[PDB]
Ligand binder design. Structure first.
Ligand SMILES: C[C@@H]1O[C@@H](O)[C@H](O)[C@H](O)[C@H]1O
Ligand SMILES: C[C@@H]1O[C@@H](O)[C@H](O)[C@H](O)[C@H]1O
Ligand SMILES: C[C@@H]1O[C@@H](O)[C@H](O)[C@H](O)[C@H]1O
Ligand SMILES: C[C@@H]1O[C@@H](O)[C@H](O)[C@H](O)[C@H]1O
Ligand SMILES: [Ca+2]
Ligand SMILES: [Ca+2]
Ligand SMILES: [Ca+2]
Ligand SMILES: [Ca+2]
Ligand SMILES: [Ca+2]
Ligand SMILES: [Ca+2]
Ligand SMILES: [Ca+2]
Ligand SMILES: [Ca+2]
Ligand SMILES: [Ca+2]
Ligand SMILES: [Ca+2]
Length: 582
């Protein structure tokens, strides 16, 4: 059994024209025989216990409050936490927008709300939002220039700002720099926050790490010298718990494949259950050429290093040049322990390189049960090298064997995987203007109008699409996308990537919520679906691959999360998660 979060009922109630829509979690600790009673202000609404974890109360009002009681072995359990009614289709979390600044070159910049993650920092079973702020002069690794400070905040859903960490002048702003992990690493029931830090990083209590005044910014506005640190911060306070020297260490900038400072600063990170029971922290560096991955534990108040994979070591040459601007984490070989899907290569739970497809770097990656007729997980990936044998590859996750691929002869920058067509079993995949079945059979002539995120939003087991401030649904019979939601007043992030601040099943039933910032970053808006469903599934945060996907969603070029099992049309009934909570 794996350590997973002790979650509350996640009860939510939302005003609609047809009454109050109520939804809640089916928890990983609950059996299939569990049913529910719904109460409005202490009065039961349903004559018989309901199975599905959504309910429409036609008689409810904006002033109503709700509780749910589980019915276990014929006996009603204590009431859930109380839920009030959302007067809007989204819940707003007001933000403390940081003031703008000026760089040493006299350039002004302002802040916008950017990537988020979630963790329960106080252990009450409700997630907090951990938000990264982005200065308007943040930089790709290919670009020279100074950047504003990167700020990381924690908010409760009620709008309480718990803390701000300022990573300081020695941490450059941009997609590929700070990769922040939020997770209960030590198993006490409370999340911590881990990331790369430097001299001058200021914790949530205002304490500066290392050499407070050291300035290692070069004239390119890059930080290519000086110490580098790894810090675990307390989730509730942002206080520094432990700081160690960061590995993978920089060495020489040129070790990584250029001298101007691009390849050296290509970071990814993850949470992986390397021991099959408890989480470990993964920090990576490099992917275009030299590539390193290091694993750590944070347990019993100590940070410990577990292993290193270094492509520059004799025997590891095949593990250079393969990584994406993203990764996945999953138990692919069935031993209960997590492996790392690092673009075109994979790394075992003990840090040993498993395989490389040799197809090289790409920009999108999907690891899940894509072909439910083929035992094991599958990885769908796209490839940037115009001379790659395949521009899109669909492989056995464990062995790396290519099941099918298609030559593109060009950079294929986007690819998606989602069950959008029930006429073909399993998840469809699309890239480079074509849609395919899980078996590689081209379907029709179109593709969905986005190739970004997949989201479970409506009531059916097919997956919808998310891009920018929109949720769309694929009309598979007619081969066209149609809009389901346009979140007016909400904005996506990261320029052409057009990503939400976060997509995750963070409250209510199994459908995924979306967190988008407002245009002016004065608030985050959490949208939860009010489309009824006949289906009950365990909260996705209790799935061992989905939960890990939420932890890495922020990293570099944000990718959508996947479940460890096939969730889609014609799916088998999912088994209870094998888990315990702290
Ligand atoms: C942009 C940058 O922001 C902070 O790190 C400090 O105020 C520093 O002096 C300034 O140069
Ligand atoms: C306010 C504080 O001032 C100095 O100690 C450093 O510049 C540090 O990075 C900054 O956070
Ligand atoms: C400006 C922005 O920066 C990063 O998020 C990505 O490179 C994206 O494609 C670009 O549009
Ligand atoms: C939309 C906007 O685009 C780019 O300029 C930056 O990457 C920023 O972080 C993002 O939110
Ligand atoms: Ca909490
Ligand atoms: Ca903890
Ligand atoms: Ca495994
Ligand atoms: Ca293994
Ligand atoms: Ca790329
Ligand atoms: Ca499979
Ligand atoms: Ca399908
Ligand atoms: Ca659906
Ligand atoms: Ca939900
Ligand atoms: Ca990102």
């Amino acid at each position: 059994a794996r350590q997973m979060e002790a979650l509350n009922r996640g009860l939510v109630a939302v005003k609609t024209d047809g009454g109050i829509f109520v939804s809640w979690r089916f928890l990983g600790t609950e059996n299939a025989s569990v049913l529910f009673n719904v109460y409005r202000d202490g009065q039961k609404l349903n004559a018989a216990p309901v199975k599905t974890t959504n309910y429409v109360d036609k008689n409810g009002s904006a002033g109503s409050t709700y509780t749910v009681r589980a019915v276990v072995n014929g006996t009603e359990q204590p009431a859930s936490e109380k839920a009030s009614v959302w007067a809007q289709p989204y819940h707003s979390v007001p933000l403390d927008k940081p003031a703008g600044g000026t760089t040493p070159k006299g350039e002004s910049y302002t802040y916008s709300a950017n990537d988020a993650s979630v963790g329960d920092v106080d252990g009450d079973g409700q997630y907090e939002l951990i938000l990264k702020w982005d200065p308007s002069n943040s930089k790709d690794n290919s670009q020279d220039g100074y950047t504003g400070d990167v700020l990381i905040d924690a908010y409760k859903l009620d709008g309480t700002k718990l803390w701000r960490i300022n990573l300081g002048k020695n941490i450059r702003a941009g997609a590929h720099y700070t990769q922040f992990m939020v997770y209960d690493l030590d198993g006490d029931g409370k999340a911590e926050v881990a990331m790369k830090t430097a001299d001058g990083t200021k914790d949530g209590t205002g304490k500066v790490i290392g050499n407070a005044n050291a300035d290692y910014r070069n004239e390119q506005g890059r930080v290519l010298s000086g110490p580098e640190y790894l810090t675990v911060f307390q989730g509730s306070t942002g206080k520094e718990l432990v700081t160690a020297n960061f590995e993978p260490a920089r060495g020489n900038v040129s070790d990584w494949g250029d001298s101007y400072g691009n390849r050296v600063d290509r970071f990814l990170a993850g949470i992986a259950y390397l021991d099959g029971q408890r989480p470990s922290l993964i920090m990576t560096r490099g992917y275009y050429a030299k590539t390193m991955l290091v694993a750590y534990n944070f347990r019993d108040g100590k940070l410990s290093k577990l292993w290193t994979l270094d492509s520059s070591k004799s025997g590891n040459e095949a593990f250079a040049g393969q990584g994406n601007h993203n990764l996945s984490i999953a138990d692919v070989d069935g031993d209960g322990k997590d492996e790392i899907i690092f673009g075109s290569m994979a790394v075992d739970h003990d840090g040993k390189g498993m395989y490389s497809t040799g197809l090289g770097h790409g920009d999108a990656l999907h690891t899940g049960d894509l072909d439910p007729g083929r035992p094991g997980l599958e990885v769908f990936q796209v490839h940037e090298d115009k001379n790659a044998k395949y521009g899109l590859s669909f492989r056995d996750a464990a062995t790396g064997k290519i099941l099918w691929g298609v030559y593109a002869g060009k950079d294929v920058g986007r690819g998606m995987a989602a069950d959008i067509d029930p006429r073909y079993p399993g998840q469809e995949v699309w890239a480079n203007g074509s849609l395919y079945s899980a078996k590689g059979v081209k379907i029709g002539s179109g593709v969905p109008s986005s190739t970004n995120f997949g989201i479970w939003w409506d009531g059916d087991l097919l997956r919808e699409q998310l891009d920018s401030n929109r949720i769309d649904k694929w009309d598979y019979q007619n081969g066209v996308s149609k809009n389901m939601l346009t979140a007016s007043g909400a904005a996506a992030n990261n320029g052409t990537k057009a990503t939400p601040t976060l997509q995750a099943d963070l409250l209510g039933d199994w459908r995924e919520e979306v967190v988008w910032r407002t245009e002016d970053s004065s608030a985050l808006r959490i949208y939860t679906t009010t489309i009824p469903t006949e289906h009950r599934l365990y909260t996705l945060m209790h799935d061992p691959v989905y939960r890990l996907g939420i932890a890495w969603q922020n990293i570099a070029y944000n990718q959508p999360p996947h479940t460890s099992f096939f969730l889609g049309d014609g799916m088998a009934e999912q088994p209870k998660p094998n888990m315990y909570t702290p």
